[PDB]
Specification:
heterodimer, A: about 325 residues, Transferase(Phosphotransferase), domain 1, Phosphorylase Kinase, domain 1, about 35% helix, B: about 20 residues, alpha+beta, elongated, binds 3-methyl-4-phenyl-1H-pyrazole, cAMP-dependent protein kinase inhibitor alpha (chain B), ATP binding (chain A), cAMP-dependent protein kinase activity (chain A), nucleotide-binding (chain A), kinase (chain A)
């Protein structure tokens, strides 16, 4: 049963949520190999865990920079959620720790690269290819939302491809445990629900809207609302108009009309029957939900294995020292980390 | 074409999160 599985997952989550793992490794247990991606207050590096020889992705945040960007609470959210959570289609937190200068989150390494890189190169995904990925997101949101978590940053840049060609959602820097509504202006312009841009209190429905943006982008090769500047994107998102490619199937267009619905009483995922409205839509008729969860379905794209520690599916970034001050920074701000 | 306008836009690279 889905209800039964969720019930026991929430039991597992709550224990870890209320008593979070802390200080479970140290920087010099890892060999730093290469930068896999960059962000505002931090980067992500391929590292090797020397004691086991396992490869991992280590997220490094400069505490001083987190503070300047007013992301203290959000960073504490990210770590506290990721250590508590456990689901096949999320990058699992293996270790976390901090030193005088930085915060560290060590997650499983997905060597396939970002969906973003593959989507841009290939141009667009076929509907079966798009549906495969979409299903994995549908299930991840079902899991997360059942734990009262909102994700708030769905986009291809945040979806890593694993050696089996399945997805891992990563970057929980805006994820939050909220019962009820919340107000923070955050996310990525192309993927923002109308609620958010109009400064309403909002809820998990914004994640289902974001799913509609992603499915569209995967299947079209470009997003449903784009312009050169964010303001122009926001004017389009709140206009209530959306244009589908002629190659989009009837089923696709109708799923997206119900996902990209400005009206919350009508938006799929946010209705009385919740996520099943999405799972039982015709576009997903071919989808064996349990076989996807079980990773039994054959991936439409299996990434090139060139060994462990291969990074050829990721772009190159300018490498930058991990400097560790002799003085502790922001001890109080990050005490619970 | 819509594809052409996208590819010619400034937002075909990785997109950064916003914040208030
Ligand atoms: C966490 C992670 N696991 N595998 C790859 C990862 C990332 C994450 C952010 C950016 C680049 C690469």
């Amino acid at each position: 049963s889905v209800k039964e599985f969720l019930a026991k997952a929430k039991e597992d989550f709550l224990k870890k949520w209320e008593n979070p793992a802390q200080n479970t490794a140290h920087l010099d247990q890892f060999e730093r190999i290469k930068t896999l991606g960059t962000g505002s207050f931090g980067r992500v590096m391929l590292v090797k865990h020397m004691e086991t020889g396992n490869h991992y992705a280590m997220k490094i945040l400069d505490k001083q920079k987190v503070v300047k960007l007013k992301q203290i609470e959000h960073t504490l959210n990210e770590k506290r959620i990721l250590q508590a959570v456990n689901f096949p289609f999320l990058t699992k937190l293996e270790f976390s720790f901090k030193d005088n200068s930085n915060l560290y989150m060590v997650m499983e390494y997905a060597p396939g690269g970002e969906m973003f890189s593959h989507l841009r190169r290939i141009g667009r995904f076929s509907e079966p290819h798009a549906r495969f990925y979409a299903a994995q997101i549908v299930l991840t949101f079902e899991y997360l939302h059942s734990l009262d978590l909102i994700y708030r940053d769905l986009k291809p840049e945040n979806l890593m491809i694993d050696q089996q060609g399945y997805i891992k959602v990563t970057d929980f820097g805006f994820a939050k445990r909220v019962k009820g509504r919340t107000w923070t202006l955050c996310g990525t312009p192309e993927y923002l629900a109308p609620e958010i841009i109009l400064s309403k209190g909002y809820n998990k429905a914004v994640d289902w809207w974001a799913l509609g943006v992603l499915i569209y982008e995967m299947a079209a090769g470009y997003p449903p609302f784009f312009a050169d500047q964010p303001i122009q994107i926001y004017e389009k998102i709140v206009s209530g108009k959306v244009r589908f490619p002629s190659h989009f199937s009837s089923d696709l267009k109708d799923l997206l009309r119900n996902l990209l619905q400005v009206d919350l009483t009508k938006r799929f995922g946010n209705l009385k029957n919740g996520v099943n409205d999405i799972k039982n839509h015709k576009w997903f008729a071919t989808t064996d939900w349990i076989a996807i969860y079980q990773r039994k379905v054959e991936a439409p794209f299996i990434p090139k294995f060139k060994g462990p520690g291969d990074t050829s599916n990721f772009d190159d970034y300018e490498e930058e020292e991990i400097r560790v001050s002799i003085n502790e920074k922001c001890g109080k701000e990050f005490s619970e980390f | 074409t819509t594809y052409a306008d996208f590819i010619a836009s400034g937002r075909t690279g990785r997109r950064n999160a916003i914040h208030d």
